[PDB]
Structure 1
Amino acid sequence: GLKVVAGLGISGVSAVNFLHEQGYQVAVTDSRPTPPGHDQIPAGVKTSFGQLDQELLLQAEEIILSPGLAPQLPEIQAAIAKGISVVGDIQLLRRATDVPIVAITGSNAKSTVTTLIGLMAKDAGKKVAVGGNLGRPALDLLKDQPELLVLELSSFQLETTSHLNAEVAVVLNMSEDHLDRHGNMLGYHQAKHRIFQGAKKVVFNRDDALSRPLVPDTTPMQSFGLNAPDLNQYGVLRDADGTLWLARGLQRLIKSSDLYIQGMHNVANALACLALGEAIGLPMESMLETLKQFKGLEHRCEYVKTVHDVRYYNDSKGTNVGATLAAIDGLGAAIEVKKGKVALILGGQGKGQDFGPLRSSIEKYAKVVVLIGEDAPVIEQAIQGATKILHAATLKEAVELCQRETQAEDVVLLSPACASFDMFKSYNDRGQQFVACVNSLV
């Protein structure tokens, strides 16, 4: 019947155009007055902008809900109570193609892992299409007739997805995020674990209790973790002298020091990609060549510059406590033998997070924390006593204070554990500004 797209934006434009091409009657509604993508819709599509049209939504045979709109909205609740199907664009993609899907979610590392396994598949000779994130709408991936899809899927997208029937699926990790929408970790975990509906194979993280799914006994499962792996699992092996290798069972695969991506969380990301690749048949020799060359993504605990024998790291995309914990632990362990310590810049919009999990790593590895942003007082209350705490009113002042506090073999880390919008346009803006500050140090 009538398909009603609820919420425009990039994915909403993708859904309207896809449904129109396939010969459906499509209407669209959005609360914003003139929504992004107004100029990108075909004329003749009925549009009800300015108000989320409750009457139009109740006229629908099916509603295609933007991931930016909660199913809990009262207008959407009224439709669900009438029995109207509410799905997202990922559901449209699933119906449109039979090709194998590699499905990836998790609180952190989704884009890093999605990019890497996509590169592993491409380098191995697969006609792969990679997307699902903002700006890579999943329906547009059908255009080039790929033989394989690699989808980065958010908890919001998974909430409205059923019977994904992935060739292989993974929840990489979970930590506190997106509770403004999901309410609590219960709702959040349930949303992500929809990625396993009909999954043909499962990869899971041995070291994260919220990764392993409940699936039928016939469903093959393979795990990764940061310990010596069991037979046919992924993990780490240490030589007698301590040298760390990525490994599968008893076989050593590649030294972690031979990767460009650093820190045990990136070792785990690489191992997850090897397991995803094994599930779709990629040869190990090819996967390791891809892995050796992979540089990691911008603003993901990224090396910027060395100034006076102190290395500076941009982790502006560390927008939650779990990401920042990984950054502190990774740099702290890396410099421990040379007796270096971390000077950490923390703060911004804290989103009501529990900052307690940072205390032990700050106490172990940090010589100073410089607090910025609107939730600096709440964060200070949580980390008081763990190490020396300073305040700065601007990012530039924070970088200068960290420079003053550090000596050769220390590192300076911007890993805010917070959203950026109280002082910046985006985490990208915050990271670019950090790089500019570092480049202006003398």
Structure 2
Amino acid sequence: RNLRDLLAPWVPDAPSRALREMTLDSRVAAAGDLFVAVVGHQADGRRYIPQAIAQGVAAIIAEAKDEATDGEIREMHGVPVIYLSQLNERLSALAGRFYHEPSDNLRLVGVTGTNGKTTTTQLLAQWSQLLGEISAVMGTVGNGLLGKVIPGSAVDVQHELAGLVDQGATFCAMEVSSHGLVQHRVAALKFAASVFTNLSRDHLDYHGDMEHYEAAKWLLYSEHHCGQAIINADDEVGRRWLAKLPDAVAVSMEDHINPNSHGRWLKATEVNYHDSGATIRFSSSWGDGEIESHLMGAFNVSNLLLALATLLALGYPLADLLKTAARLQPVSGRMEVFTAPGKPTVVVDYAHTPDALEKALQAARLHCAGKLWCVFGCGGDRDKGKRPLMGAIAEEFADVAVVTDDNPRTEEPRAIINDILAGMLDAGHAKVMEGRAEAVTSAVMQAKENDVVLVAGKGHEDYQIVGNQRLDYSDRVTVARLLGVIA
């Protein structure tokens, strides 16, 4: 890593210096580092140029605005300070070159939109790896090889991606936040494909406003190497963009494919939702087929179809994708299904807010021939407002509501339950059982074979906080043991 070669595309005849790490943070800038001094939310990094010189940085690259011309080379105390205009906009490209263009050395797929980003990202990584890639994820949860995820600027993005390259990753599925995109955090990444799970947003009912939003986004995406575009056609904005993009792949599970276009497409023709998942029948320009998904709910059909359409576009053969589909697994703590011969189906989900609980019950309902049971509680010593709302949701969207404890902490457990019951029209119809383990047992043992039992609130968060003590407890372990299966 040499400053001269680093800047060869923008600043010719730049001085020759060995560079260690690249950083925006003057506090961690150490000997031999490249310090990068940028202007942000009224925060000017050029302030700290003396500190960085004092700490022995080999070189500095600094925002040119109001201080220098673009490509201007200065020398402070033997340390080269090179100024560049629009540094924030160029940071990704610069870091890219510094870290030897990691996005040119694996297959990078970007996923954008509000819903289904996290799951679609995971499914891409999982499926690609089943087909022989060594896959990785970059997201909000964290970054890393599949199964070894570790819990942010344009530089960190490139640095992390290089780290994955070094660890042997050949495929990376990356969640791209709306804000990250706008701040140019992924500006120079070479995406092999871009998945748009949805393009719509609230608060745009002025015809003017939707126009500005779309124009801003379209401009933003026009500046990126998006690669193959995979677009959810069950989105209003998605459909409009598809009409302007003849090489984009249209994906639908609500019949929004127009065959007159002769573009590439994939759609679900029918879905049988049953106890263990979904049998998804689909047609596409690559051909037709049937997938046995072990994921629950309609959203996860869409997520899976988006991942499929993407991998098909990237050239993975339909036959191999179909052959590996039954091995796709739920995202940890997210609608994880447990089945056993002659026993009720049990779903463990992290849902701990009114909206998440409603969504989980709606999804579980699709797989439920009999009665839908809901076992849940609310956290103690936290905001109480959600309690009656979660009560009302359980009463409305499930057939049997079993109210129990969920991390009561120092608060009187029964007081929490009362707050939940307060929100119901017919509190007397709820079952209350304290001991969460006992409540789960009560549901599972009483539920019929064609019933579904949703155990909500914890997901994979395997403890029960009672008083000060974090007790060992797991919904997954309890359920598995009751069903005679292995968690």
TM range (shorter): 0.5 to 0.7
Matched, 1:116 2:123: yes
Structure 1 residue 404: Cα displacement: 6.9
Alignment of 1:201-212 (within 5 A): 201-209=228-236
Q: Establish whether residue 396 from structure 1 lines up as the match of residue 437 from structure 2.
A: yes
CA–CA distance in 1 between the matches of 2:471 and 2:232? Answer: 31
Question: Against the structure 1 CA distance between its residues 278 and 418, is the aligned structure 2 distance closer, same or farther, given a 3 Å change threshold?
Answer: closer
Residue 292 in structure 1 maps to residue 326 in structure 2: yes
Work out which of the residue numbers 169, 178, 192 in structure 1 matches 2:194. Answer: 169
Corresponding residue SS for 1:234? strand
Distance 1:423-1:383 versus aligned 2 partners, 3 A rule: farther
TM-score, length-scaled by structure 1: 0.61
Q: Which amino acid aligns with 1:343?
A: C
Q: 1:108 to 1:343 in 2, by over 3 A?
A: same
Q: Distance in 2 between matches of 1:106 and 1:424?
A: 35
Superposed CA RMSD: 5.5
Aligned to 2:282: 247
Q: How far does residue 102 in structure 1 lie from its aligned partner after superposition?
A: 0.9
Q: Does 1:138 align with 2:169?
A: no
The answer to whether the 8 Å contact 1:108/1:323 transfers is no
Q: Secondary structure at the match of 1:235?
A: strand
Instruction: Give the percent of matched residue pairs that are identical in Structure 1 and Structure 2.
Output: 16
**1:433 and 2:463 aligned:** no
Q: Is the 8 A contact 1:167 1:200 kept in 2?
A: yes
Which residue of structure 1 aligns with residue 454 of structure 2?
413
- In 1, Cα distance between equivalents of 2:395 and 2:241: 35
Q: Does 1:260 align with 2:263?
A: no
Instruction: Summarize deviations over 1:278-332 as a string: whole Å, max 9, x none.
Output: 221222111111212223333221134659833322112x456665444322321
Aligned match of 1:103? 110
Q: 1:144 to 1:205 in 2, by over 3 A?
A: same
Q: For 2:116 and 2:393, how far apart are their aligned partners in 1?
A: 22
- Equivalent residue letter for 1:246: R
Change (3 A) 1:436 1:27: same
2:248 maps to 221
1:26 and 2:62 aligned:
no
Using a 3 Å threshold, how does the CA distance of structure 1 residues 122 and 327 change in structure 2: closer, same or farther?
same
Residues 289 and 165 of structure 1, relative CA distance in 2, 3 Å threshold: same
1-side partners of 2:240 and 2:162: how far apart?
27
Please give the TM-score of this superposition, normalised by the length of structure 2. Answer: 0.57
Give the C-alpha shift of residue 379 in structure 1: 6.6
CA distance change for structure 1 residues 237 and 431 in 2, over 3 Å: closer, same or farther? farther
Equivalent AA in structure 2 for residue 248 of structure 1 = S
C-alpha distance in structure 2 between counterparts of 1:211 and 1:353, whole Å: 33
Post-superposition offset of 1:270: 1.7
Q: Which moved more, 1:305-314 or 1:408-417?
A: 305-314
Comparing 277-286 with 393-402, which one deviates more in the overlay?
Answer: 393-402
Q: Distance in 1 between matches of 2:435 and 2:394?
A: 25
1:85 aligns with 2:117: no
Aligned partner of 2:309: which letter?
A: A
- From the superposition, tell whether residues 122 and 386 of structure 1 become closer, same or farther in structure 2 (CA, over 3 Å): same
Matches within 5 A, 1:261-340: 261-304=295-338, 309-316=343-350, 318=351, 323-336=356-369, 339-340=370-371
Please tell me whether Structure 1 or Structure 2 has the larger radius of gyration of its CA atoms. Answer: 2
Cα distance in 2, alignment partners of residues 209 and 417 from structure 1: 34
Cα distance in 2, alignment partners of residues 158 and 387 from structure 1: 50
Cα offset, 1:103, TM superposition? 0.5
Amino acid at match of 1:345: F
Please report how far the alpha carbon of residue 273 of structure 1 lies from its aligned counterpart in structure 2 after TM superposition: 0.9
